[PDB]
Amino acid sequence: GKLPPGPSPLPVLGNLLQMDRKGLLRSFLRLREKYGDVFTVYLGSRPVVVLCGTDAIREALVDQAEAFSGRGKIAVVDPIFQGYGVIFANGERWRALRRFSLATMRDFGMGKRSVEERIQEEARCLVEELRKSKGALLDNTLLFHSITSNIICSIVFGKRFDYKDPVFLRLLDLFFQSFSLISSFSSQVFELFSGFLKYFPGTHRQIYRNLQEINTFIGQSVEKHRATLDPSNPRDFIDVYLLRMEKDKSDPSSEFHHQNLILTVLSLFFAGTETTSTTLRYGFLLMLKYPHVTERVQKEIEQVIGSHRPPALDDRAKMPYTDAVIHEIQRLGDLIPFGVPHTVTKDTQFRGYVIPKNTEVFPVLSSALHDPRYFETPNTFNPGHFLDANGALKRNEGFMPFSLGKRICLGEGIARTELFLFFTTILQNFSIASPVPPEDIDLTPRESGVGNVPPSYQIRFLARH
Numbered sequence: 001g002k003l004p005p006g007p008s009p010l011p012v013l014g015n016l017l018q019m020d021r022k023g024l025l026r027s028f029l030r031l032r033e034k035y036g037d038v039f040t041v042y043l044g045s046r047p048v049v050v051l052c053g054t055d056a057i058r059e060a061l062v063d064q065a066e067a068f069s070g071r072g073k074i075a076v077v078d079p080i081f082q083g084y085g086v087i088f089a090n091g092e093r094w095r096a097l098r099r100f101s102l103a104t105m106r107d108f109g110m111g112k113r114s115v116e117e118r119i120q121e122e123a124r125c126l127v128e129e130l131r132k133s134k135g136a137l138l139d140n141t142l143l144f145h146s147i148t149s150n151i152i153c154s155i156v157f158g159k160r161f162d163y164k165d166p167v168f169l170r171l172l173d174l175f176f177q178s179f180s181l182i183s184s185f186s187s188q189v190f191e192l193f194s195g196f197l198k199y200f201p202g203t204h205r206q207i208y209r210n211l212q213e214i215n216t217f218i219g220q221s222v223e224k225h226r227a228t229l230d231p232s233n234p235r236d237f238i239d240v241y242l243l244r245m246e247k248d249k250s251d252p253s254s255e256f257h258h259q260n261l262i263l264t265v266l267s268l269f270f271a272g273t274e275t276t277s278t279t280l281r282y283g284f285l286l287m288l289k290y291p292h293v294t295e296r297v298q299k300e301i302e303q304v305i306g307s308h309r310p311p312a313l314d315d316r317a318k319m320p321y322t323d324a325v326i327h328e329i330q331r332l333g334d335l336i337p338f339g340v341p342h343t344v345t346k347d348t349q350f351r352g353y354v355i356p357k358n359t360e361v362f363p364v365l366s367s368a369l370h371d372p373r374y375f376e377t378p379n380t381f382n383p384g385h386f387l388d389a390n391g392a393l394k395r396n397e398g399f400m401p402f403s404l405g406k407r408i409c410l411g412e413g414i415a416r417t418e419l420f421l422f423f424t425t426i427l428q429n430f431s432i433a434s435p436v437p438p439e440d441i442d443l444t445p446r447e448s449g450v451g452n453v454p455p456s457y458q459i460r461f462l463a464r465h
């Protein structure tokens with residue numbers, strides 16, 4: 001049986017000595033050199049199994065997507081989730097919420113259409129709020145978080161917030177700031193010595209007080225939604241959850257109990273707002289480094305969508321180039337370097353090693369988007385990776401930014417749609433430009449932990465006439 005190869009760990013400390021100074025990801029890469037694609041590492045006491053390569057990630061999450069369908073714990077945030085919510089819940093509790101939220105939000109907009117029209121709309125706004133900026137050097141960080149947040153809030157909270165609404169701007173600002181702490185160094189030195197450090201002050205405390213405020217807003221908005229619930233017509237995700245939360249109060253095992261409502265509404269409100277938004281942020285920072293790549297996208301929009309009607313989702317097909325630039329933005333982006341933690345649900349048999357039940361598994365996704373076996377020139381923005389000789393969209397076994405298996409990003413649908421509608425609708429109406437010389441544009445992440453934060457930058461949105 002035995003666990004995969006890795007360095008011999010010391011008591012308490014685990015393989016802390018073999019760890020690279022830069023952080024976790026870098027470390028897993030420096031060990032893959034000595035052991036290869038699949039190997040074992042001990043983060044302090046807890047042994048994890050790292051997975052590198054496009055192959056290893058699928059042989060596990062795709063070909064045995066049941067023994068790996070288990071969610072692990074993320075150091076700094078377990079305190080607030082304690083295993084609840086739809087993202088961190090396990091076993092039956094997981095399927096319980098997963099299916100519910102996947103179904104609730106779906107037949108409430110998501111799925112397709114109702115949301116598409118919602119996005120073209122939110123985008124329409126993002127376009128007039130940008131005209132207002134009269135193309136003055138701004139910081140799209142906040143604004144971006146807004147447009148992707150509204151899309152999700154309309155599904156969960158049902159309502160939509162104004163771009164300059166103080167409350168709204170605080171949750172957003174809170175999400176951003178928090179993701180940045182969740183991906184900092186402590187958020188990692190914690191993963192290791194969480195039990196050790198938690199007794200002393202640090203950023204781990206700040207991540208708590210942060211999610212707190214949000215949980216409040218979530219919570220105090222559950223009350224508002226409470227006294228206004230017209231069972232004959234639910235308004236959003238909260239109502240539906242409320243209708244079934246009240247319904248099953250005779251089954252003291254129904255995972256539908258506040259704890260979840262808040263933590264699930266937080267999982268969908270944080271992710272739904274966070275990633276899609278910083279992907280575009282990274283996207284555009286990449287559109288300044290390569291202005292010649294923008295001209296094309298703005299031309300492909302011109303041939304297809306023309307320029308007298310907002311981009312529709314259908315257009316993603318007739319626009320194979322822009323599709324590839326996005327897959328490439330997403331690929332180089334790599335917002336989630338080593339995917340949210342996993343765990344085998346049973347004694348699993350993998351490649352010749354026997355991973356005991358409940359053993360944490362990290363699917364280094366970064367080493368799948370950057371894999372040389374599937375991506376020629378993986379470290380170079382190359383819309384080619386996703387195209388054939390006849391210049392058409394081509395699939396690629398290495399493109400797994402949302403991940404794979406039963407734990408695959410619940411919101412892959414929305415996201416891919418939001419990206420294509422916002423991204424083109426903007427480039428359709430505006431033409432980015434920034435004071436920094438393209439060769440000087442740096443894409444190195446500002447923070448790289450469980451998440452990759454693109455450095456902050458200024459960009460002006462010159463209107464196109």
Ligand code: HEM
Pocket residue numbers: 071086087088098152267268271272273275276277279335336339340341363401402403404406407408409410411412414415
């Ligand atoms: C730029 C877009 C996005 C990217 C790159 C992304 C990334 C991912 C990744 C890498 C995971 C972990 C998969 C795993 O367990 O191995 C995940 C999970 C998750 N994401 Fe996203 N995500 C995106 C947007 C969204 C959106 C728009 C929502 C909200 C509707 C969302 C909600 C979720 C949820 C609920 C999970 C947990 C799923 C589960 O436990 O089964 N994400 N996503």
Ligand SMILES: Clc1ccc(-n2ccnc2)cc1
Pocket residue numbers: 074077182270271272274275340409
């Ligand atoms: Cl702790 C954590 C992990 C993943 C996500 N996420 C973001 C987008 N999809 C998943 C949010 C929070």
